[PDB]
Amino acid sequence: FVNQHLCGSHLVEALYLVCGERGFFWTPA
Amino acid sequence: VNQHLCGSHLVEALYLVCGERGFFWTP
Amino acid sequence: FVNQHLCGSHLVEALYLVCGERGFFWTPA
Amino acid sequence: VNQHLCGSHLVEALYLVCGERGFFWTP
Amino acid sequence: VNQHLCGSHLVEALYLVCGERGFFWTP
Amino acid sequence: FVNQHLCGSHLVEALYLVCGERGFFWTPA
Amino acid sequence: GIVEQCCTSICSLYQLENYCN
Amino acid sequence: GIVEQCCTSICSLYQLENYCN
Amino acid sequence: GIVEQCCTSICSLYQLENYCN
Amino acid sequence: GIVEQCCTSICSLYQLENYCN
Amino acid sequence: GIVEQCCTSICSLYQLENYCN
Amino acid sequence: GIVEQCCTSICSLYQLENYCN
Ligand SMILES: [Cl-]
Ligand SMILES: [Zn+2]
Ligand SMILES: [Zn+2]
Numbered sequence: 001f002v003n004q005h006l007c008g009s010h011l012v013e014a015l016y017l018v019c020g021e022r023g024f025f026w027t028p029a
Numbered sequence: 030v031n032q033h034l035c036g037s038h039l040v041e042a043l044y045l046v047c048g049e050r051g052f053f054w055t056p
Numbered sequence: 057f058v059n060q061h062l063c064g065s066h067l068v069e070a071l072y073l074v075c076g077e078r079g080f081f082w083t084p085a
Numbered sequence: 086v087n088q089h090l091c092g093s094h095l096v097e098a099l100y101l102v103c104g105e106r107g108f109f110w111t112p
Numbered sequence: 113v114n115q116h117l118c119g120s121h122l123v124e125a126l127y128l129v130c131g132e133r134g135f136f137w138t139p
Numbered sequence: 140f141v142n143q144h145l146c147g148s149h150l151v152e153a154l155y156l157v158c159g160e161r162g163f164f165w166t167p168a
Numbered sequence: 169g170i171v172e173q174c175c176t177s178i179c180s181l182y183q184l185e186n187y188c189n
Numbered sequence: 190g191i192v193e194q195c196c197t198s199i200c201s202l203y204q205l206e207n208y209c210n
Numbered sequence: 211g212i213v214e215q216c217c218t219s220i221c222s223l224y225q226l227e228n229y230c231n
Numbered sequence: 232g233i234v235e236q237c238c239t240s241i242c243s244l245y246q247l248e249n250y251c252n
Numbered sequence: 253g254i255v256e257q258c259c260t261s262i263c264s265l266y267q268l269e270n271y272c273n
Numbered sequence: 274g275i276v277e278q279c280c281t282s283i284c285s286l287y288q289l290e291n292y293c294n
Binding site: 001003004005006007008011014015018019022023024025026027028029 | 253254255258259260261262263264265268269271272273
């Protein structure tokens with residue numbers, strides 16, 4: 001897996017792929 | 030319509046729309 | 057709505073979503 | 086084919102292809 | 113399913129998954 | 140065509156579009 | 169859910185913000 | 190239009206630049 | 211232009227909408 | 232190939248890394 | 253939070269998975 | 274490599290095409 005900074009929509013999409021059917025929470029606050 | 034690709038677009042769109050308040054993604 | 061810098065394809069996609077059926081113009085010059 | 090998702094990909098592609106000259110998106 | 117759009121999503125996903133080791137895309 | 144820095148998934152997608160049926164190799168090492 | 173409402177029809181940003189926190 | 194020409198068939202970058210300004 | 215307003219500065223949704231058709 | 236395996240069904244990251252170098 | 257861990261710092265796949273449901 | 278040429282420096286369409294198959 002990539003070893004780098006992931007930000008914004010890129011981070012969100014990464015969570016999407018990695019979490020799969022579990023889904024995820026995106027709480028950037 | 031492949032739900033998975035649509036999902037990708039949906040979480041991007043929700044990133045923009047929700048901003049600070051964020052969202053939960055629960056298929 | 058997000059309060060942040062939007063650039064390149066990210067800005068373009070943001071316009072896509074926000075403008076909807078109106079469409080938009082992308083004139084970065 | 087869902088025209089909206091395709092549209093998303095299309096405006097990204099046009100971003101790259103058109104570059105400086107830009108484009109108008111008018112569904 | 114339009115194979116081309118799916119392909120777009122696939123090469124993004126492979127970017128993330130493969131990271132350093134990279135990949136070959138050969139339709 | 141755009142004259143600018145292309146990085147990460149952006150560079151990969153650019154290769155996707157530009158190379159078409161030839162495909163491409165993504166070797167960032 | 170968001171997938172059924174928005175994957176066959178187009179959802180606007182106003183319909184999409186329903187799914188925010 | 191671009192949607193009909195390019196959403197069922199694949200458009201190359203050369204066909205896509207038709208739709209630039 | 212849109213780059214100075216929304217990429218170098220931050221735009222609101224309304225400023226962003228100034229660039230719709 | 233990756234297109235047939237993954238464009239009709241969902242591939243996980245574990246199935247996707249099969250296609251890495 | 254996820255921004256400090258994975259956007260300002262780098263996250264592993266496991267750290268990234270701490271934010272799944 | 275492609276990162277030095279097109280991400281740290283700018284690539285033309287031809288330089289970018291050096292990385293097609
Ligand atoms: Cl799609
Ligand atoms: Zn980006
Ligand atoms: Zn898509």
